[PDB]
Short mmCIF file of C-alpha atoms and ligand atoms in Angstrom, two decimals:
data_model
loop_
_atom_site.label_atom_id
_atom_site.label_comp_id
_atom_site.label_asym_id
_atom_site.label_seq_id
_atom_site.Cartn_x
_atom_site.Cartn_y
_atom_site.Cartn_z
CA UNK G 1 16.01 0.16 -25.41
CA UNK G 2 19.43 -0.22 -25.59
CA UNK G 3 21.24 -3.69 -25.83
CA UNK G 4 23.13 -3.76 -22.47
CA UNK G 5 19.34 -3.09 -20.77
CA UNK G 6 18.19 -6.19 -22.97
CA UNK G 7 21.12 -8.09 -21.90
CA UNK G 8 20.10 -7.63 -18.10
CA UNK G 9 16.14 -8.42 -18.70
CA UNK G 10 17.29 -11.85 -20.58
CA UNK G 11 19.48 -12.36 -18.08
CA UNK G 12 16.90 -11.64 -15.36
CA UNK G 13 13.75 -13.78 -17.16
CA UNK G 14 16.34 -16.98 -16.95
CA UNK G 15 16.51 -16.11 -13.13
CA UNK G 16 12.76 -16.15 -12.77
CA UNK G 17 12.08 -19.91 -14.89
CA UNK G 18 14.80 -20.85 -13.16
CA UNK G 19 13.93 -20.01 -9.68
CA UNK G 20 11.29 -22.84 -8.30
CA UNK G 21 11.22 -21.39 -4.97
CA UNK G 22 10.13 -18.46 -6.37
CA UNK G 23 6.37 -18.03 -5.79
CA UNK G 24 5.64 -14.16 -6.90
CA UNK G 25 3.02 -12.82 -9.28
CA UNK G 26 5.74 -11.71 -11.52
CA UNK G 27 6.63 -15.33 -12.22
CA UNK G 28 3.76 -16.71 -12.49
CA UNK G 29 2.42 -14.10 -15.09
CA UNK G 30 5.74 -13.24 -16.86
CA UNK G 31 5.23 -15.70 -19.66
CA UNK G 32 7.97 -15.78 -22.37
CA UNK G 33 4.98 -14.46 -24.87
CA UNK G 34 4.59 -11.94 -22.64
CA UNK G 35 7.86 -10.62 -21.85
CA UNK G 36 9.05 -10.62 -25.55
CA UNK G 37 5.95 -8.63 -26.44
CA UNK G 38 6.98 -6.30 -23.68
CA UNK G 39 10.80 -5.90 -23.38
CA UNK G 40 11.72 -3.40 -26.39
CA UNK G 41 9.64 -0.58 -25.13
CA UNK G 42 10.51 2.55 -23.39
CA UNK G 43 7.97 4.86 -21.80
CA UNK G 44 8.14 8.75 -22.04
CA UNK G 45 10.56 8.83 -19.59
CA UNK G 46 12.67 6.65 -20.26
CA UNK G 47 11.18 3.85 -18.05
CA UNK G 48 12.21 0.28 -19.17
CA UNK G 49 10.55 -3.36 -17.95
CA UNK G 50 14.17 -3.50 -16.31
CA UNK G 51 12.81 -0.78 -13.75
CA UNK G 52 9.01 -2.46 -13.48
CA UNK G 53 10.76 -6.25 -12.46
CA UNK G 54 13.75 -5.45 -10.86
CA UNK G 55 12.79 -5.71 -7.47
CA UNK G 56 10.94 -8.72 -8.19
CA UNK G 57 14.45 -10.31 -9.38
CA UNK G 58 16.60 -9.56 -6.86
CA UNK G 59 13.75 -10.52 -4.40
CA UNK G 60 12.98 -13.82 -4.91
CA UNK G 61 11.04 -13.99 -1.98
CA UNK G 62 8.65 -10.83 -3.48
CA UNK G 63 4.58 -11.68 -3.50
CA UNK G 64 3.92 -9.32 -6.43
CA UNK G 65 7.42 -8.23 -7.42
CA UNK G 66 6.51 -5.74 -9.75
CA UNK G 67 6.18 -1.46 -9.72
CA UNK G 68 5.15 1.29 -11.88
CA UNK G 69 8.11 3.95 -12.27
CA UNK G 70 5.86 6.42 -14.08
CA UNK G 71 1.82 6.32 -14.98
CA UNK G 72 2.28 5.73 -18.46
CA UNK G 73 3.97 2.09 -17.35
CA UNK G 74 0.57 0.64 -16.69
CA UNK G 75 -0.23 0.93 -20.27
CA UNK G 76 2.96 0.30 -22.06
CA UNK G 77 3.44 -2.81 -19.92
CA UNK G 78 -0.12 -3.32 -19.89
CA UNK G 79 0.13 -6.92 -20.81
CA UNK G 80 2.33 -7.83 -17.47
CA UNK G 81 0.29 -5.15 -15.44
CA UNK G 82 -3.41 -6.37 -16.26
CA UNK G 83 -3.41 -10.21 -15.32
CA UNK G 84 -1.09 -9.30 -12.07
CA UNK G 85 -3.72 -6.76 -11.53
CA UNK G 86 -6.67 -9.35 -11.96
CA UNK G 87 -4.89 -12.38 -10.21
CA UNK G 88 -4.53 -9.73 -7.28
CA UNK G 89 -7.46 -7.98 -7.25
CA UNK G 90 -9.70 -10.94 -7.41
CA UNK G 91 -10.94 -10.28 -10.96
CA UNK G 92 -10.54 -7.55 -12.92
CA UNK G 93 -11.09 -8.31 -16.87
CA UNK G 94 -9.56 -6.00 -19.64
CA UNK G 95 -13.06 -4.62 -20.07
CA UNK G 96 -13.52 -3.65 -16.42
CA UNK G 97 -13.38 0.20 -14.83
CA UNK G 98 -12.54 0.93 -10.99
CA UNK G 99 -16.20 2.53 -9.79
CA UNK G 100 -16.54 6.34 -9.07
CA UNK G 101 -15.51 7.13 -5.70
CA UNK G 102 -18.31 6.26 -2.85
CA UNK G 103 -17.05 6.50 0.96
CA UNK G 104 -20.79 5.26 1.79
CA UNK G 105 -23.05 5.11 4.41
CA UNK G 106 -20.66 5.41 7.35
CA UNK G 107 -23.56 5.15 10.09
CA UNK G 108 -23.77 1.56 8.90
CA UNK G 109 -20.16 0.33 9.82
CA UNK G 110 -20.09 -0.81 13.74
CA UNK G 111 -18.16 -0.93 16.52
CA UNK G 112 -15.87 -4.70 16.31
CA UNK G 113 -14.84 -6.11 19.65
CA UNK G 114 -17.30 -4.01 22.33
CA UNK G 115 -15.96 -6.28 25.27
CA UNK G 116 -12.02 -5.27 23.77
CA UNK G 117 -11.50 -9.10 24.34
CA UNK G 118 -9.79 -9.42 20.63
CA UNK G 119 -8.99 -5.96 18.69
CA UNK G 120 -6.01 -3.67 20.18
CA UNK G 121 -5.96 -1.04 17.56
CA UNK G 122 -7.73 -0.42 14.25
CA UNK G 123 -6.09 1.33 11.37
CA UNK G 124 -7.23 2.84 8.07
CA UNK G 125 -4.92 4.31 5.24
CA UNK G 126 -5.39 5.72 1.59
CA UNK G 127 -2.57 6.89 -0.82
CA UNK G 128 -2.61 9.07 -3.30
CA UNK G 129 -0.25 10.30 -5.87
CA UNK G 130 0.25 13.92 -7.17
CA UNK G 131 -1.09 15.16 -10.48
CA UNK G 132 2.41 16.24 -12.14
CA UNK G 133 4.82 14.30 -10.82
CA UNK G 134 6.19 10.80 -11.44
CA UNK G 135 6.60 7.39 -8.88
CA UNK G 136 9.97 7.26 -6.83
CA UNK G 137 12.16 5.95 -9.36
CA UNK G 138 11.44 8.75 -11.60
CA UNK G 139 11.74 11.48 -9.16
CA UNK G 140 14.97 13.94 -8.67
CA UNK G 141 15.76 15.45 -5.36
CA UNK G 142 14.26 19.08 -6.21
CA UNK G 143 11.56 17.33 -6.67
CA UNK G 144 10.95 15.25 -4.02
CA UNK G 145 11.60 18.42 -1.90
CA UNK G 146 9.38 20.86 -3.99
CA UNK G 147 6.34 17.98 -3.37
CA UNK G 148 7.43 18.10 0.48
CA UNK G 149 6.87 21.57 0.57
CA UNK G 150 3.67 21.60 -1.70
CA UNK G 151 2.26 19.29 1.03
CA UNK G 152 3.66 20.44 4.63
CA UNK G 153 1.91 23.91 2.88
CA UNK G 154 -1.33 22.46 2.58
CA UNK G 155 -1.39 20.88 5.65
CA UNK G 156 -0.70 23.53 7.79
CA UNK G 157 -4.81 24.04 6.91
CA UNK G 158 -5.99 21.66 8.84
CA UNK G 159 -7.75 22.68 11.35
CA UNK G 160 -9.30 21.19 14.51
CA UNK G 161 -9.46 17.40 15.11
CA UNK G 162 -6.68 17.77 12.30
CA UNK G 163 -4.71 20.64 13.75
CA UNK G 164 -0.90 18.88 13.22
CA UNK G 165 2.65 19.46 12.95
CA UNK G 166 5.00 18.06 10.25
CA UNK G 167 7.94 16.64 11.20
CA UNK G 168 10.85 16.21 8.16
CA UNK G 169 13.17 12.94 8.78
CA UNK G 170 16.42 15.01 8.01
CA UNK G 171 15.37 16.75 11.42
CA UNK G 172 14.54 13.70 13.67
CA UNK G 173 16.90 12.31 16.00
CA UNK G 174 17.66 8.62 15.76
CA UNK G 175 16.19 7.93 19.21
CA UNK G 176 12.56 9.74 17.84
CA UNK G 177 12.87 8.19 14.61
CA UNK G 178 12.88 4.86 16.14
CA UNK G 179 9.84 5.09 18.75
CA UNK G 180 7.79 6.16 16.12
CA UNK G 181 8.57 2.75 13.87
CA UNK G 182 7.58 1.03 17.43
CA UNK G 183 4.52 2.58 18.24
CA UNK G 184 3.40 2.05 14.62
CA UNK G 185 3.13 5.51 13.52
CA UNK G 186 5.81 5.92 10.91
CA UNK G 187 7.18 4.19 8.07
CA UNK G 188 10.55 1.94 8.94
CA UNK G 189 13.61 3.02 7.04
CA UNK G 190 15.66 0.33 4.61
CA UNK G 191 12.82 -1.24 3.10
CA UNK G 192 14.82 -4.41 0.17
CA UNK G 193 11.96 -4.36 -1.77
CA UNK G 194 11.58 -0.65 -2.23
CA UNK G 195 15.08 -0.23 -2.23
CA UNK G 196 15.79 -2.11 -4.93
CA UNK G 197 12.92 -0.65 -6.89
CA UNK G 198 15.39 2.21 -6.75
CA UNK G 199 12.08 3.80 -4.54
CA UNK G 200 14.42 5.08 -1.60
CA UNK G 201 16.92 7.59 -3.92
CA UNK G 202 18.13 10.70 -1.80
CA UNK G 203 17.20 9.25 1.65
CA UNK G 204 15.70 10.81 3.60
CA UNK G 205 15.40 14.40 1.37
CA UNK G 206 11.90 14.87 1.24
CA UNK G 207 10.46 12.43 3.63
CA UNK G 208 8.31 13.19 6.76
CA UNK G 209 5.45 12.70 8.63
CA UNK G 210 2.42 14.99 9.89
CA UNK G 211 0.62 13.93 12.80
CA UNK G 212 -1.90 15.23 15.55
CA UNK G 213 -1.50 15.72 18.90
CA UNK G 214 -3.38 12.19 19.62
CA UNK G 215 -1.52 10.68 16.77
CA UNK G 216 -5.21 9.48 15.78
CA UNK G 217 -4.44 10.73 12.12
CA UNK G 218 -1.26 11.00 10.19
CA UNK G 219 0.02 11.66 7.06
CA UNK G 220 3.32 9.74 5.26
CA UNK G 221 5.02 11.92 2.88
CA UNK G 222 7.56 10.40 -0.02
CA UNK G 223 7.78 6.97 1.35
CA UNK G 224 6.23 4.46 -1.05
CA UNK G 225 3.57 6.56 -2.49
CA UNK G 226 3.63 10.62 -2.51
CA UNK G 227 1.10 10.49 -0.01
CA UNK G 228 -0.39 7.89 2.52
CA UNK G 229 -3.50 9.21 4.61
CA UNK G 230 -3.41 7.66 7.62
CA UNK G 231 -6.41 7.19 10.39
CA UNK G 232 -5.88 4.97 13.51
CA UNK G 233 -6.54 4.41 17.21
CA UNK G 234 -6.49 1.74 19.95
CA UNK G 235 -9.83 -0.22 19.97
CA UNK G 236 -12.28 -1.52 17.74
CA UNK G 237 -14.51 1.68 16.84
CA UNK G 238 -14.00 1.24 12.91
CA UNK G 239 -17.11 3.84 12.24
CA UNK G 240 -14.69 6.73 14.24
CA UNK G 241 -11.54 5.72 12.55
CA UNK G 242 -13.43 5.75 8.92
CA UNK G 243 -15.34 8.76 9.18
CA UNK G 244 -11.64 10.93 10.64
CA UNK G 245 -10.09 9.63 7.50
CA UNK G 246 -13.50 10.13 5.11
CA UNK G 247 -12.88 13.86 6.71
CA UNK G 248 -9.14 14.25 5.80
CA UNK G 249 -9.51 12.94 2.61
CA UNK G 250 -12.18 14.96 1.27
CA UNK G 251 -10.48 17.95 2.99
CA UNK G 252 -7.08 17.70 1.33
CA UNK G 253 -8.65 16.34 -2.21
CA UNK G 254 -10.13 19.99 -2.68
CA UNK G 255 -6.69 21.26 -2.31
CA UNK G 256 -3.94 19.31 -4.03
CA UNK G 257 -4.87 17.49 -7.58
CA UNK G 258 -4.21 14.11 -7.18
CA UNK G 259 -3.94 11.70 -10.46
CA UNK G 260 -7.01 9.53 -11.07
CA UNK G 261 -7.73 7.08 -14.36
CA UNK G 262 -11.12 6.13 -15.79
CA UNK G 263 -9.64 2.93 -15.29
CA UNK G 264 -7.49 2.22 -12.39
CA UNK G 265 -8.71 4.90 -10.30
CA UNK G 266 -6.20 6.60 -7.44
CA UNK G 267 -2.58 5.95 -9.34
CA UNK G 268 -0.47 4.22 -7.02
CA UNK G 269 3.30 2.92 -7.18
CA UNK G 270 2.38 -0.60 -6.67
CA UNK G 271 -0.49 -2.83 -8.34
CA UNK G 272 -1.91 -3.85 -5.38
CA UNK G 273 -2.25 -0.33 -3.96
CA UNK G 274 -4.92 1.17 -7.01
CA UNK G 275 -8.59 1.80 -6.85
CA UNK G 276 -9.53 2.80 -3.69
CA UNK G 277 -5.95 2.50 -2.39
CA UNK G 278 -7.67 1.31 0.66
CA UNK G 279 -6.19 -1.09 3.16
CA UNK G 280 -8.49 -0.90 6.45
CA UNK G 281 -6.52 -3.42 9.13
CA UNK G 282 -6.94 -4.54 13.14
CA UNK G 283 -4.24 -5.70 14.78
CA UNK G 284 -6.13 -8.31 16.32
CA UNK G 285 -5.35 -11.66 18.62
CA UNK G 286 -7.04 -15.23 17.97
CA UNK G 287 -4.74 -17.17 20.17
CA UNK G 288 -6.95 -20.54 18.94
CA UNK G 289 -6.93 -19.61 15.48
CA UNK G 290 -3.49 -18.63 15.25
CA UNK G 291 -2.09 -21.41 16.80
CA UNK G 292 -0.53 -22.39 13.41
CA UNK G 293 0.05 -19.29 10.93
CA UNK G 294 -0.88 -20.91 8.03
CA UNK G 295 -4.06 -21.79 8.84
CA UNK G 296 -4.99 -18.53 9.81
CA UNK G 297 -3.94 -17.52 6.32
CA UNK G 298 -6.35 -20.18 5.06
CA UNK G 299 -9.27 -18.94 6.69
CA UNK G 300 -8.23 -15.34 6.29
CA UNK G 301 -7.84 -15.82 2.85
CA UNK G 302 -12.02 -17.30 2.19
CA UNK G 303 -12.92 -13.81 3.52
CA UNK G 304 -10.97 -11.83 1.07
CA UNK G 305 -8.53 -10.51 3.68
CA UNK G 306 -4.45 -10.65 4.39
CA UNK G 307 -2.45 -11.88 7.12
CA UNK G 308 0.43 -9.46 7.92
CA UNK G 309 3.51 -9.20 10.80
CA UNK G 310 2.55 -7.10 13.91
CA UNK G 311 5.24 -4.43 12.57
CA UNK G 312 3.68 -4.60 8.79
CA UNK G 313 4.26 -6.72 5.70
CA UNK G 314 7.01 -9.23 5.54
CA UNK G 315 7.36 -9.30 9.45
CA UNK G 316 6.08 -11.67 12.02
CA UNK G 317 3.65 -11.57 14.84
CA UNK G 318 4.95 -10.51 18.04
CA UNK G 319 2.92 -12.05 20.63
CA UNK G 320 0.30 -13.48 18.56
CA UNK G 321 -0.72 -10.47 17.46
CA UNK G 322 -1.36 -10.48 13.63
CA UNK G 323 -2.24 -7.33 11.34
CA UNK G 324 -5.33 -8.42 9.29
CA UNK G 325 -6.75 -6.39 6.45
CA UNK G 326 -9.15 -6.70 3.16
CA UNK G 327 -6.42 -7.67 0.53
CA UNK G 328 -8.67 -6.00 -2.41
CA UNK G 329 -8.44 -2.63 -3.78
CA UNK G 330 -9.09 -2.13 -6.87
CA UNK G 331 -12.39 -2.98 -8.69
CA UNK G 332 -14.63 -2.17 -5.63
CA UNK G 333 -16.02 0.72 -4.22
CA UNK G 334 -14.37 2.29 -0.60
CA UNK G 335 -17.10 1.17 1.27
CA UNK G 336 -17.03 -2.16 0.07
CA UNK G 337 -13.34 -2.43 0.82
CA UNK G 338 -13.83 -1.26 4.56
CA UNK G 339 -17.14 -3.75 4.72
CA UNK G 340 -15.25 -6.66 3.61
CA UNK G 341 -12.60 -5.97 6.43
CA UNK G 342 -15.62 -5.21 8.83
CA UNK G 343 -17.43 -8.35 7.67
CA UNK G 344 -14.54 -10.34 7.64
CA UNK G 345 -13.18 -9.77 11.27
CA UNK G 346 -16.74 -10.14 12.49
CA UNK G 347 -16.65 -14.11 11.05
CA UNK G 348 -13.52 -14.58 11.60
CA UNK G 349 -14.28 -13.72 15.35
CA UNK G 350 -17.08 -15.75 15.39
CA UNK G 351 -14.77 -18.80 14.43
CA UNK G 352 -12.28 -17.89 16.97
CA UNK G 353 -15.27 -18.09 19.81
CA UNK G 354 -16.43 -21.63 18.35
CA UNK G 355 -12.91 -23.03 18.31
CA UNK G 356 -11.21 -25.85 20.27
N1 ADP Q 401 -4.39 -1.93 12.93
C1 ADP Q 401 -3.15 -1.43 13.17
N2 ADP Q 401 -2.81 -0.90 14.35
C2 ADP Q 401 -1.60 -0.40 14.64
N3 ADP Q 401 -0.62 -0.37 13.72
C3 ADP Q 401 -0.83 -0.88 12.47
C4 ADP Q 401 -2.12 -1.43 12.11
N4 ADP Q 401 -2.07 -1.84 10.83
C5 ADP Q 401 -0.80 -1.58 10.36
N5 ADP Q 401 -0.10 -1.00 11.36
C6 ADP Q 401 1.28 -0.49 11.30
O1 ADP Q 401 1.39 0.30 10.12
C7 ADP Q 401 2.77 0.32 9.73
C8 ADP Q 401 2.89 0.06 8.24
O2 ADP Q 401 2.73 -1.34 7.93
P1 ADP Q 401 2.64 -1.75 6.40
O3 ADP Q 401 2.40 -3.24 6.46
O4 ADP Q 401 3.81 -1.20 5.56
O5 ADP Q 401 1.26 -1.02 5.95
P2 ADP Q 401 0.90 0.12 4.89
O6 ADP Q 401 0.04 -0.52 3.84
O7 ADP Q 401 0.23 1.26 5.63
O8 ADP Q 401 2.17 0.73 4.30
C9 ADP Q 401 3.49 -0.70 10.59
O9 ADP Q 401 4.18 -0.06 11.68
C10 ADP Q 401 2.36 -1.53 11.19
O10 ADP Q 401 2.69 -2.02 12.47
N1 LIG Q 402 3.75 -2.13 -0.20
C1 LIG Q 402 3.51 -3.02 -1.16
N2 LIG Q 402 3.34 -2.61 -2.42
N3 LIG Q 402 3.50 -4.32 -0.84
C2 LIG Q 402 3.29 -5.41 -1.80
C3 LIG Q 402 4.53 -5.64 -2.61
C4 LIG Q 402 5.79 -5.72 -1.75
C5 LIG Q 402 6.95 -6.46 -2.43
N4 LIG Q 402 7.41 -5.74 -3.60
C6 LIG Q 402 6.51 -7.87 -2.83
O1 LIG Q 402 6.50 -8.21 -4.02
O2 LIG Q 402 6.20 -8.67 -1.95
MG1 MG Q 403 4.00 0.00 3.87
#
């Protein structure tokens, strides 16, 4: 590592000790033991610790703060990585391994709000990266269009319930572009945190979305992971949502390698997306509950789950209407990821019924 890199990562530890406000898992696990045990090494590529924290430093107001530019990062920065990934994941020791992949017993998930009196939609999305290639910041532009066309390939196979079109975002109109971010279906444009992850290079080469007709499932392409699989629908029928995207999953595994670790599990971009990769979510309205935000979090937070903005993370309910989701991913199997979101909701509806 060169010394005008070191220069920048002094320069940005100072601004995280310094920074009080600051309330991420990068400070609180960026330890001046750890970072000098950390900030001389170089990955394969060429990835430094200036391109794992950057995004953390320039966003103070970050949660996590931290991403992987290449696979081999979660090893060589394994001692920043591993308690971020244990604080998050609710324990997750050095000796621990993500299980083997189990979808479960999907007859035993149920329907959540039969009377619709609570739940308006109910969402559930996996990523997955592909075998080969490296995370955003590592990527050039032939590749991020050579992945593009590996996937629109594969799924012009789908067939059936699946049957979809893919739709590039150099080919959208602004006025298309922006009903999709409002009816929830695809990703916004100009996110800080990824942008300054240097995650949003060549914008918007290589992007898209594939969708249905319904728009019941959907597939992300090049946004923060190479791939997000995406199954949703208005109501509360979790068991219908789950089993479309047990479907798609399986179905598309068999014909594009993804990269896996006898670890980690499904390699992700960010931390908090490994394992399972799983974040199963309602947008849901407690009007008692959620009187006060924070002590919805509170509650939400006894039952393993996170409190999100009705257009996604760092954005705030519109009309009381809250995304909720389990918050852990790694170090449990899929089916215990979408049962504690099912179980969750269920008490958290309960509490909602019994309150003032
Ligand atoms: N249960 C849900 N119903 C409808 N839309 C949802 C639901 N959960 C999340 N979303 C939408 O998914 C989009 C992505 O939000 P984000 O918080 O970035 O989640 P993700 O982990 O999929 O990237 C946003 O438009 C958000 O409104
Ligand atoms: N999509 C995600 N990885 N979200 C969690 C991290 C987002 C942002 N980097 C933060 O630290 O708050
Ligand atoms: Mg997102």
């Amino acid at each position: 590592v060169d010394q005008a890199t070191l220069d920048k990562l002094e320069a940005g530890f100072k601004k995280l000790q310094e920074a009080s406000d600051c309330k991420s898992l990068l400070k609180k696990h960026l330890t001046k033991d750890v970072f000098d045990s950390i900030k001389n090494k170089k990955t394969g590529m060429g990835a430094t610790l200036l391109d794992v924290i950057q995004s953390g430093v320039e966003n103070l107001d970050s949660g996590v703060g931290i991403y992987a530019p290449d696979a081999e990062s979660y090893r060589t920065f394994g001692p920043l990585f591993d308690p971020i990934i244990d604080d998050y994941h609710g324990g997750f020791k050095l000796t621990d391994k993500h299980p083997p992949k189990q979808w479960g017993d999907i007859n035993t998930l149920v329907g959540l709000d039969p009377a619709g009196q609570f739940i308006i939609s109910t969402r559930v999305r996996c990523g997955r990266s592909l075998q080969g290639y490296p995370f955003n910041p590592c990527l050039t532009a032939e590749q991020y269009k050579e992945m593009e066309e590996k996937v629109s390939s594969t799924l012009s196979s789908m067939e059936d319930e699946l049957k979809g079109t893919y739709y590039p975002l150099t080919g959208m109109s602004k006025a298309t572009q922006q009903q999709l971010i409002d009816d929830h279906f695809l990703f916004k444009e100009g996110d800080r945190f990824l942008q300054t992850a240097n995650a949003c290079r060549y914008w918007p080469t290589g992007r898209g979305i594939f969708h249905n007709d319904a728009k019941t499932f959907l597939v992300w392409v090049n946004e923060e992971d190479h791939l997000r699989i995406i199954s949703m629908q208005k109501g509360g029928d979790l068991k219908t949502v789950y089993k479309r995207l047990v479907t798609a999953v399986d179905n598309i595994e068999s014909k594009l390698p993804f990269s896996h670790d006898d670890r980690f599990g499904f390699l992700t971009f960010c931390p908090t997306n490994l394992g399972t990769t799983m974040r199963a979510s309602v947008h849901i309205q407690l009007p008692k509950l959620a009187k006060d935000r924070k002590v919805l979090e509170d509650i939400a937070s006894k039952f393993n789950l996170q409190v999100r903005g009705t257009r996604g993370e760092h954005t705030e309910s519109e009309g009381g209407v809250y995304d909720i989701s389990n918050k852990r991913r790694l170090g449990l199997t899929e089916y215990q990821a979408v049962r504690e979101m099912q179980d969750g909701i269920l008490e958290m509806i309960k509490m909602e019924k019994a309150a003032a």
